[PDB]
């Protein structure tokens with residue numbers, strides 16, 4: 001079926017939970033043996049969210065190459081994404097090592113450091129120009145260059161330096177600051193405006209490594225971001241945009257990381273975002 005009328009048909013019939021449970025039943029199951037090794041317990045935020053072995057990002061290190069991060073490679077859309085958990089106190093150096101090694105231009109953050117009165121990720125970037133951060137375990141230096149605070153999101157320019165080679169690179173930090181502590185946004189308008197700002201920066205384009213996108217577990221809000229981006233790109237590429245099937249795209253993405261889209265409300269929100277976004281594109 002088309003999307004917008006399939007949407008109204010699920011609303012009128014109140015069957016979002018049944019649609020979402022079908023997706024959960026059909027989703028891929030692949031091994032995640034490296035994630036579960038005892039030496040990696042303090043590298044995982046949640047015991048039930050792990051990268052598959054076949055798609056995990058490897059650190060260029062011979063001691064321990066493990067990080068909780070996955071490469072989502074969308075062949076028809078010609079887009080790739082790295083989805084990862086919010087960094088932990090003992091993985092902030094690994095996080096920036098990955099950004100460096102994978103040649104990423106942009107980092108997309110969809111959570112606040114504290115939500116619901118608890119810490120959802122480490123403070124992993126500097127908040128003042130004159131107070132830079134040094135990660136001694138991976139030999140990197142990170143400096144805040146500029147910050148632009150808007151009503152729904154903040155954009156930061158960062159300088160990442162590999163202290164071993166003295167090479168430097170400019171990284172863009174895109175921080176969506178207004179996702180509610182509970183539920184999903186009422187309107188997709190600010191989320192779509194944010195997606196378009198990331199696109200306009202070059203951070204999603206083939207001349208760079210994959211964008212790094214995270215929330216707390218790296219599957220819920222993060223899944224919504226890449227699902228909406230890929231569906232909108234396919235609607236622009238194909239002769240028949242009504243052939244784009246959001247459930248089929250989501251199942252394709254779940255071949256590369258488990259659990260993408262965590263609730264039926266996030267699934268409905270993803271439909272809404274793609275529907276409204278397709279009208280603005282034209």
Ligand SMILES: Cn1c2c(c3ccccc31)C[C@@H]1C[C@H]2[C@H](O)CN1
Nearest residue numbers: 145157158159160167168169170171
């Ligand atoms: C524009 N730019 C540059 C750097 C940089 C670091 C942070 C923000 C912006 C930056 C470092 C050097 C020179 C230039 C170049 O673009 C890259 N290499």
